[PDB]
Amino acid sequence: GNISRYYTHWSGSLEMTFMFCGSFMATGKLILCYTPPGGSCPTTRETAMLGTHIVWDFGLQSSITLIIPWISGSHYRMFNNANVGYVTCFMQTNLIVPSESSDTCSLIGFIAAKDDFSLRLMRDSPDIGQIDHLHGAEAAYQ
Amino acid sequence: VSETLVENFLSRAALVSKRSFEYKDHTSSTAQTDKNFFKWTINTRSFVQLRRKLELFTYLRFDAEITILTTVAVNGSNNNTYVGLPDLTLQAMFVPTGALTPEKQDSFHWQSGSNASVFFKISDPPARMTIPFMCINSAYSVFYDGFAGFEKTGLYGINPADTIGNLCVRIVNEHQPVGFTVTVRVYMKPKHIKAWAPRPPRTLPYMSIANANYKG
Amino acid sequence: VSETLVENFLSRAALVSKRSFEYKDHTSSTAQTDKNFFKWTINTRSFVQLRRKLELFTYLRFDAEITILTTVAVNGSNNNTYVGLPDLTLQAMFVPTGALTPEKQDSFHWQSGSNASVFFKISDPPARMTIPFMCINSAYSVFYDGFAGFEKTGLYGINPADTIGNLCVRIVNEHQPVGFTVTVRVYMKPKHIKAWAPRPPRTLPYMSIANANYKG
Amino acid sequence: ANYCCAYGEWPTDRFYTLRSVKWEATSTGWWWKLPDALNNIGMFGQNVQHHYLYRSGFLIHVQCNATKFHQGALLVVAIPEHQRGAHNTTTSPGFDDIMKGEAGGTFNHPYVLDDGTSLACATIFPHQWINLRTNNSATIVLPWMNAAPMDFPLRHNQWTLAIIPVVPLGTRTMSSMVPITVSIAPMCCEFN
Amino acid sequence: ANYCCAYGEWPTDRFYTLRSVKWEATSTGWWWKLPDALNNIGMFGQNVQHHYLYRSGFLIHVQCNATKFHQGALLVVAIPEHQRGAHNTTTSPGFDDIMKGEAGGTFNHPYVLDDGTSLACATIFPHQWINLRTNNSATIVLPWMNAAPMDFPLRHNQWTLAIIPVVPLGTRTMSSMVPITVSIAPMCCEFN
Amino acid sequence: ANYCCAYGEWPTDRFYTLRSVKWEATSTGWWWKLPDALNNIGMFGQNVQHHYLYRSGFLIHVQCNATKFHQGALLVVAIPEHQRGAHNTTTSPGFDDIMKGEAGGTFNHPYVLDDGTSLACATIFPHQWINLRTNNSATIVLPWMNAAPMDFPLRHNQWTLAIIPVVPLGTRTMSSMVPITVSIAPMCCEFN
């Protein structure tokens, strides 16, 4: 995101990785759903299952990787004057943990660009604004 | 047979903007958004002749060459003594789409390193730079049979693509004790022109720039 | 894929200093150290945008290209008759580290043969010179996790190496009967850039130039 | 039967037959926006609804049912990116009167094609002639016709099929009536 | 056991084991400046005292002693030239709070790494993940990492090893405790 | 992983995952009629609605999420043409309590399988065992199983997947809970 904010047109496929960070004996299932750019994010499990999805059993597997298909951000809007796609997660089952372990588990996610990513038309990032003046600024001139 | 090629037919330098702006030190807050600088979005529908010549093909792909010729006239007031016309330097900045356009003569956007700028003097050969093909599609759409936004409010015939960008010209010099009138004349000449799907010519003189309405 | 190379990503000319100084004949002793000359130590942390762009790699090696564009405005006082703006010549001297920086407009350091100087006129294309890589180490240290001096008083994050040097600009002409305001605009563009050890970007806007303190 | 292949090139057999239009002695013409029509009616429509990107090229067949005692000439022309304007107003045409669906629209100024151009020079586009003394049918094949490899069917129309009677229909009895049938078949049926 | 070799390259077995740190449910993180630590304690320290120039490359091993009922994720990251800043003040950090010795320091704003950057993008540095359900150890090899062939260990720190708990340690009993052991072994042991 | 291929034979990857059922210490069992379920929910359902004849063979996967401290045995059995009867009445079962849809039903007399047969001899059918100390999953492949080459999915159920806990689930705490997930994938996806 930070690097893409320095450019105007981006295109390519993203990859997303999720890591489960619960106990060794924690078990359960999750449904990861991807929706194409033209559509609405599902709200419930059965309408989520209609589209493309993957059932993740984090009892055995600890990390899951799903590849977002190739997408050109500029054509899809770019101040058409968003909704480029969603990734949602639903609980297929409950979370089963032993009594000795903690009853709350956590999930983290990573994102990266594939080798087909492209950037064009470098611009000025709006992330940090021009501070009127920093603390030591006249030292260079004196 | 070489005279009637599309490249020779369309690659003629034509005046596309002839705006002029005042320069004097406006102590009072008046004449906003045009105090000391001139802004123009790069289009081709401004002039009827060039618009009709271009509106013969559905798709075009070309590089625009910009020549900026500027003249200064003695401020039509105050002392008439012809002390001379000082060598004022000018800054012409090309702002591609998706970037920020300056709103005042002293905004920080004039110092951005992303936007390419040209500094030239009033007593030099006119400045010249060529803008490359800057569309996300493979060619410009002279005609667009569609709506821009995904909402129904989106305007008809306006393509979110194209929109080459904006051209901003200002006087770099801080206000002299005597003001002046600056006339900016900019010429555009397409280059490396490719054309597709020829169309019948246009009768029934134009009624607007945004659309193709007619008075029949 | 060539647009996203490090050379194209960092090799953009950016304004790095926009200081202006008065020129009139100061008979009285006032406005010291900036009577008729402008001094600036060559750094990159002055402007937030360029500082953040550079602060993405631990080590950098580049040659700095300096362009000095200067404009003169009519002295905002006295007689308003536009007699014209005389062709004043300017001297820009590059003082590398370990040398003596001038303290006044008429010091003997301006005549030193060791320091390289550039003489240019107000009515010419802007002066331009390229400073080579001038560090004792193999690359510049954008970040330095150490103390400069061997004493405990040494400042944190300041490397005794680097410190490209100082740029000094003055008006060679002896004081005319009428003073003037001179604005000096200097642009820096890195060239032949090499980068090492990329770093995460910087949030939490900067609070100082010397250090990397934050307001969280 | 002797189809017109538009510009020289060559890129499933559903042939969605539209409702026939009534050709009178006072008819001005009819037009259909190809992506605008042909969707929300069939499997092509359901695919267009389920996908943001679609591929086409179409295949137009126009038929006239007339006897040997009928006379008249029909110009069948496919216009790429036919951006139409309004009449005696500076406002732009709206969504309601641009997107007519499978019903289609009718020309009100066929001499200028509702654009301000000339109907006389409309032959520069891919076209066929229907003279009701030599032939009564016309077939036109179309290419992709887009500046980008992808587009949104719900927002942008690629082609505009126009049928304009240059010579009005005539018979001894002034109650003449000839039906015109239009069939459109998408090609390669790609939706992604 | 499946070490991370930093940037792709490859340049005595003392393995100075530091005192173990206490990982609680409210811990923020720990950091050690590699030349700052590991000296004044052993033969490496005596050599660093006797020489103005030294050569390194180090070898970091991090171990966690947890049962199968423990949960949590640890990010072990080595930051080159980690110049840290202060908080809510324009003054620079001092020698006393920069040079912590073998004891090391603790992060007070691990989300920004005490620099003003983002902890999310800290994976760009040489790093390893410790998830207490798949592995409990991490090994990192480091290069020379200096602009000059020579440097002064007493004044300049080359690397900063940081251990940040992204996912807090948890168990049914809220009195959880997992010790973390760090071992550092200099490489090539050159001092001149 | 070591699937049961029913009777010795071997005949798209959609794997419609049903809602998980709650296995308690007092559960009796669950059953699903394979053509009755799996339709009106997906593309298989839309094809079944659009066609009078359909082809199948299915692929059943059953999973249990339990820890090492859980105990219990599950019998997963697929019964061909499981015509179930009522209890203490001579009237036949009705459409409402025969066609339960994707929700499925629950056994009220699992010892006799709601038929009057014996649960002990239910192993003669294609079946798998789920003992929560050696395995936690079971996979069963099914054949066509019909006397005629054609049948009507809306009126006749070909298979009945039954899950019966022979050994009740148990733990030291009597609030035990193990979810069971069932996934069904039609094979050859033929509809005509």
Tab-separated table of N, CA, C and O in Angstrom, chain B residues 79 81-89 91 110-116 119 121 124 170 172-178 180, chain C residues 12-15 18 47 69-77 79-85 122-126 183 185 187:
chain	number	residue	atom	x	y	z
B	79	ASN	N	2.257	55.408	-14.961
B	79	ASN	CA	3.218	56.168	-15.748
B	79	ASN	C	3.436	55.511	-17.107
B	79	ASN	O	3.574	54.288	-17.204
B	81	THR	N	6.029	56.136	-19.136
B	81	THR	CA	7.433	56.096	-19.528
B	81	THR	C	7.856	54.672	-19.852
B	81	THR	O	7.727	53.768	-19.022
B	82	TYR	N	8.365	54.476	-21.069
B	82	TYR	CA	8.741	53.149	-21.554
B	82	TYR	C	10.109	52.775	-20.980
B	82	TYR	O	11.137	52.767	-21.660
B	83	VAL	N	10.103	52.469	-19.679
B	83	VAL	CA	11.312	52.003	-19.014
B	83	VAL	C	11.749	50.652	-19.558
B	83	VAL	O	12.932	50.301	-19.475
B	84	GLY	N	10.825	49.890	-20.124
B	84	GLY	CA	11.114	48.581	-20.670
B	84	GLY	C	10.255	47.500	-20.040
B	84	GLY	O	9.522	47.720	-19.077
B	85	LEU	N	10.366	46.309	-20.623
B	85	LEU	CA	9.622	45.155	-20.148
B	85	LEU	C	10.590	44.201	-19.468
B	85	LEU	O	11.407	43.570	-20.156
B	86	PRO	N	10.550	44.066	-18.143
B	86	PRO	CA	11.552	43.252	-17.448
B	86	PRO	C	11.456	41.781	-17.824
B	86	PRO	O	10.402	41.270	-18.208
B	87	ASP	N	12.594	41.100	-17.710
B	87	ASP	CA	12.700	39.680	-18.038
B	87	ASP	C	12.071	38.875	-16.910
B	87	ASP	O	12.739	38.466	-15.959
B	88	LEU	N	10.765	38.646	-17.016
B	88	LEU	CA	10.062	37.816	-16.050
B	88	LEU	C	10.206	36.349	-16.431
B	88	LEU	O	10.050	35.986	-17.600
B	89	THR	N	10.508	35.511	-15.448
B	89	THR	CA	10.545	34.075	-15.670
B	89	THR	C	9.183	33.468	-15.361
B	89	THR	O	8.450	33.944	-14.491
B	91	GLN	N	6.810	29.674	-15.000
B	91	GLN	CA	6.826	28.250	-14.700
B	91	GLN	C	5.582	27.613	-15.294
B	91	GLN	O	4.460	27.999	-14.951
B	110	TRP	N	3.380	23.931	-6.451
B	110	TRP	CA	4.325	24.361	-7.472
B	110	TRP	C	5.717	23.787	-7.252
B	110	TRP	O	6.519	23.764	-8.191
B	111	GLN	N	6.024	23.330	-6.040
B	111	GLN	CA	7.341	22.809	-5.704
B	111	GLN	C	7.393	21.288	-5.705
B	111	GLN	O	8.423	20.716	-5.333
B	112	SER	N	6.316	20.621	-6.105
B	112	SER	CA	6.291	19.166	-6.086
B	112	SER	C	7.272	18.599	-7.104
B	112	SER	O	7.368	19.079	-8.236
B	113	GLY	N	8.003	17.566	-6.693
B	113	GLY	CA	8.969	16.933	-7.568
B	113	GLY	C	8.342	15.950	-8.533
B	113	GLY	O	8.950	15.591	-9.545
B	114	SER	N	7.122	15.503	-8.228
B	114	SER	CA	6.447	14.554	-9.106
B	114	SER	C	5.984	15.224	-10.392
B	114	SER	O	6.162	14.673	-11.484
B	115	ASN	N	5.391	16.409	-10.286
B	115	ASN	CA	4.935	17.138	-11.461
B	115	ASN	C	6.124	17.750	-12.186
B	115	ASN	O	6.952	18.433	-11.575
B	116	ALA	N	6.206	17.507	-13.490
B	116	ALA	CA	7.287	18.058	-14.292
B	116	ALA	C	7.001	19.512	-14.639
B	116	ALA	O	5.885	19.865	-15.027
B	119	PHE	N	10.847	25.972	-16.690
B	119	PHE	CA	11.128	27.367	-16.377
B	119	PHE	C	11.709	28.037	-17.614
B	119	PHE	O	12.685	27.546	-18.190
B	121	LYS	N	12.080	32.168	-19.745
B	121	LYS	CA	12.051	33.617	-19.625
B	121	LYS	C	11.207	34.238	-20.731
B	121	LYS	O	10.938	33.622	-21.765
B	124	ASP	N	13.076	34.739	-24.471
B	124	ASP	CA	13.702	33.537	-25.000
B	124	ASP	C	12.797	32.936	-26.055
B	124	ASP	O	11.625	33.311	-26.171
B	170	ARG	N	2.405	30.176	-14.340
B	170	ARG	CA	2.433	31.242	-13.352
B	170	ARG	C	3.666	32.104	-13.575
B	170	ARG	O	4.574	31.750	-14.330
B	172	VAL	N	6.866	33.383	-11.760
B	172	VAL	CA	7.673	33.025	-10.598
B	172	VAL	C	8.057	34.267	-9.802
B	172	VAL	O	8.164	34.222	-8.571
B	173	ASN	N	8.273	35.388	-10.486
B	173	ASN	CA	8.770	36.588	-9.825
B	173	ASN	C	7.768	37.122	-8.809
B	173	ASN	O	6.558	37.128	-9.042
B	174	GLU	N	8.289	37.572	-7.671
B	174	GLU	CA	7.474	38.223	-6.658
B	174	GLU	C	7.058	39.600	-7.171
B	174	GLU	O	7.805	40.267	-7.892
B	175	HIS	N	5.841	40.008	-6.806
B	175	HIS	CA	5.175	41.173	-7.386
B	175	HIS	C	6.079	42.398	-7.444
B	175	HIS	O	6.479	42.939	-6.409
B	176	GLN	N	6.370	42.858	-8.659
B	176	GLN	CA	7.105	44.099	-8.826
B	176	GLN	C	6.238	45.277	-8.390
B	176	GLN	O	5.013	45.161	-8.305
B	177	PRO	N	6.855	46.425	-8.091
B	177	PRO	CA	6.054	47.605	-7.726
B	177	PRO	C	5.061	48.016	-8.798
B	177	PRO	O	4.041	48.641	-8.477
B	178	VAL	N	5.323	47.688	-10.060
B	178	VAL	CA	4.416	47.981	-11.163
B	178	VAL	C	3.922	46.660	-11.739
B	178	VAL	O	4.722	45.761	-12.020
B	180	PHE	N	1.639	44.223	-14.555
B	180	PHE	CA	1.723	44.032	-15.994
B	180	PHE	C	0.625	43.083	-16.449
B	180	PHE	O	0.027	42.359	-15.648
C	12	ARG	N	14.545	12.354	-9.177
C	12	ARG	CA	13.607	13.409	-9.530
C	12	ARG	C	14.100	14.718	-8.937
C	12	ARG	O	14.378	14.792	-7.736
C	13	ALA	N	14.213	15.743	-9.777
C	13	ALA	CA	14.678	17.039	-9.306
C	13	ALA	C	13.653	17.643	-8.358
C	13	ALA	O	12.468	17.746	-8.690
C	14	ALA	N	14.110	18.044	-7.178
C	14	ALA	CA	13.238	18.583	-6.147
C	14	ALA	C	13.842	19.856	-5.582
C	14	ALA	O	15.055	19.940	-5.378
C	15	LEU	N	12.991	20.845	-5.335
C	15	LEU	CA	13.445	22.083	-4.723
C	15	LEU	C	13.888	21.816	-3.291
C	15	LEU	O	13.140	21.237	-2.499
C	18	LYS	N	14.889	27.688	-0.822
C	18	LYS	CA	14.222	28.820	-1.457
C	18	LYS	C	14.454	30.088	-0.643
C	18	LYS	O	13.537	30.864	-0.373
C	47	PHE	N	13.226	18.962	3.441
C	47	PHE	CA	11.877	18.817	2.910
C	47	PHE	C	11.331	17.436	3.242
C	47	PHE	O	12.011	16.426	3.032
C	69	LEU	N	18.417	28.524	-9.940
C	69	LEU	CA	17.575	29.434	-10.701
C	69	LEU	C	17.275	30.637	-9.823
C	69	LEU	O	16.712	30.489	-8.735
C	70	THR	N	17.657	31.821	-10.289
C	70	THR	CA	17.540	33.038	-9.502
C	70	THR	C	16.713	34.065	-10.255
C	70	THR	O	16.851	34.218	-11.471
C	71	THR	N	15.855	34.767	-9.521
C	71	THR	CA	15.043	35.839	-10.070
C	71	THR	C	15.231	37.087	-9.223
C	71	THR	O	15.499	37.008	-8.022
C	72	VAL	N	15.091	38.243	-9.863
C	72	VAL	CA	15.210	39.533	-9.200
C	72	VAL	C	13.879	40.257	-9.312
C	72	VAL	O	13.272	40.305	-10.388
C	73	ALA	N	13.416	40.801	-8.192
C	73	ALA	CA	12.196	41.587	-8.145
C	73	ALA	C	12.553	43.036	-7.858
C	73	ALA	O	13.527	43.315	-7.152
C	74	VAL	N	11.772	43.954	-8.425
C	74	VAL	CA	11.968	45.381	-8.199
C	74	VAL	C	11.903	45.650	-6.703
C	74	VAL	O	10.980	45.190	-6.022
C	75	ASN	N	12.898	46.372	-6.184
C	75	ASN	CA	12.948	46.719	-4.770
C	75	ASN	C	11.635	47.359	-4.339
C	75	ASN	O	11.250	48.408	-4.866
C	76	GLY	N	10.944	46.740	-3.385
C	76	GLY	CA	9.615	47.187	-3.015
C	76	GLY	C	9.611	48.489	-2.246
C	76	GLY	O	9.063	48.572	-1.143
C	77	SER	N	10.218	49.521	-2.833
C	77	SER	CA	10.310	50.838	-2.219
C	77	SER	C	10.779	51.859	-3.246
C	77	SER	O	10.839	51.559	-4.444
C	79	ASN	N	11.649	54.882	-5.870
C	79	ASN	CA	11.015	55.241	-7.131
C	79	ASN	C	10.486	53.998	-7.838
C	79	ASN	O	11.165	52.969	-7.902
C	80	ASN	N	9.268	54.098	-8.372
C	80	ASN	CA	8.617	52.974	-9.033
C	80	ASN	C	8.877	52.922	-10.532
C	80	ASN	O	8.347	52.026	-11.199
C	81	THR	N	9.655	53.853	-11.081
C	81	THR	CA	9.934	53.852	-12.512
C	81	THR	C	10.672	52.584	-12.912
C	81	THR	O	11.740	52.277	-12.375
C	82	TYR	N	10.096	51.846	-13.861
C	82	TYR	CA	10.644	50.561	-14.293
C	82	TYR	C	11.801	50.810	-15.263
C	82	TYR	O	11.707	50.613	-16.476
C	83	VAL	N	12.917	51.272	-14.692
C	83	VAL	CA	14.132	51.468	-15.473
C	83	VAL	C	14.674	50.142	-15.982
C	83	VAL	O	15.389	50.109	-16.989
C	84	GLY	N	14.341	49.046	-15.316
C	84	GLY	CA	14.801	47.727	-15.696
C	84	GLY	C	15.543	47.037	-14.565
C	84	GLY	O	15.835	47.616	-13.520
C	85	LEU	N	15.841	45.763	-14.808
C	85	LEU	CA	16.556	44.949	-13.842
C	85	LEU	C	17.966	44.712	-14.357
C	85	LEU	O	18.140	43.962	-15.330
C	122	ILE	N	22.262	37.055	-14.237
C	122	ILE	CA	20.840	36.963	-13.932
C	122	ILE	C	19.995	36.714	-15.175
C	122	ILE	O	18.849	36.264	-15.056
C	123	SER	N	20.521	36.990	-16.366
C	123	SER	CA	19.763	36.894	-17.607
C	123	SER	C	20.306	35.787	-18.500
C	123	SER	O	20.389	35.930	-19.721
C	124	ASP	N	20.676	34.669	-17.897
C	124	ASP	CA	21.218	33.506	-18.584
C	124	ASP	C	20.445	32.277	-18.151
C	124	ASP	O	19.696	32.315	-17.169
C	125	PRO	N	20.579	31.169	-18.878
C	125	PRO	CA	20.010	29.919	-18.394
C	125	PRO	C	20.570	29.580	-17.029
C	125	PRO	O	21.740	29.883	-16.727
C	126	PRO	N	19.764	28.973	-16.160
C	126	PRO	CA	20.195	28.765	-14.774
C	126	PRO	C	21.470	27.939	-14.693
C	126	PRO	O	21.687	27.016	-15.479
C	183	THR	N	15.925	36.416	-5.041
C	183	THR	CA	15.422	35.126	-4.589
C	183	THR	C	16.237	34.034	-5.262
C	183	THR	O	16.333	33.996	-6.492
C	185	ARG	N	16.721	30.046	-5.891
C	185	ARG	CA	16.013	28.774	-5.907
C	185	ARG	C	16.973	27.716	-6.424
C	185	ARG	O	17.459	27.819	-7.556
C	187	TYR	N	17.777	23.549	-6.986
C	187	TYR	CA	17.181	22.235	-7.165
C	187	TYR	C	18.271	21.176	-7.140
C	187	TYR	O	19.344	21.364	-7.720
